[PDB]
Ligand SMILES: Cc1cccc2c(=O)[nH]c(-c3ccccc3)c(C)c12
């Protein structure tokens with residue numbers, strides 16, 4: 001039941017999504033090992049993801065969370081990079097997308113930094129890079145990220161140098177305490193707390 005609608009580069013919705021993507025690139029502690037070396041992206045396409053069932057699932061859950069957190073869903077737009085992007089847009093998020101080895105436990109992880117999500121499009125640590133060239137820094141192969149609507153509710157705050165939510169919390173916020181320039185990462189424990197709203201197709205660009 002999923003359909004993808006292409007946005008025109010002239011549409012302001014295209015433009016505000018491209019801006020979120022480009023403005024949240026940062027340097028990573030691995031020097032680009034996992035996601036490559038770039039300062040910006042070539043955006044090739046942005047598609048709106050429409051699925052009634054998955055949307056209704058998301059909003060039913062968002063209401064429940066809101067009612068348990070002084071009528072505040074604490075909804076964000078966040079990036080998700082995954083080798084399973086094709087499964088997610090058709091079937092939604094679920095426990096198969098849980099990162100068992102994650103620093104904040106076995107949940108589904110989202111980033112404010114697009115370049116953080118970009119590290120995972122070929123799997124943990126960047127796997128072995130693109131299918132065609134086995135290159136984690138490939139400038140040629142087309143990559144995909146999701147920009148998702150994520151309900152955080154009451155988020156447990158964890159400073160930093162499918163499992164359950166910490167009791168009484170709806171999500172976890174991993175806030176980098178050492179790198180002042182890294183933005184936050186978030187973890188949810190219920191697949192129904194995220195909706196994959198935009199599918200963004202892109203290349204990383206070789207710095208000049
Ligand atoms: C740890 C983390 C922080 C911030 C963002 C992400 C992300 O976007 N994707 C993933 C991830 C998803 C599927 C398989 C492997 C990693 C992960 C793990 C992730």
Ligand SMILES: [Zn+2]
Nearest residue numbers: 130133138141
């Ligand atoms: Zn390649």
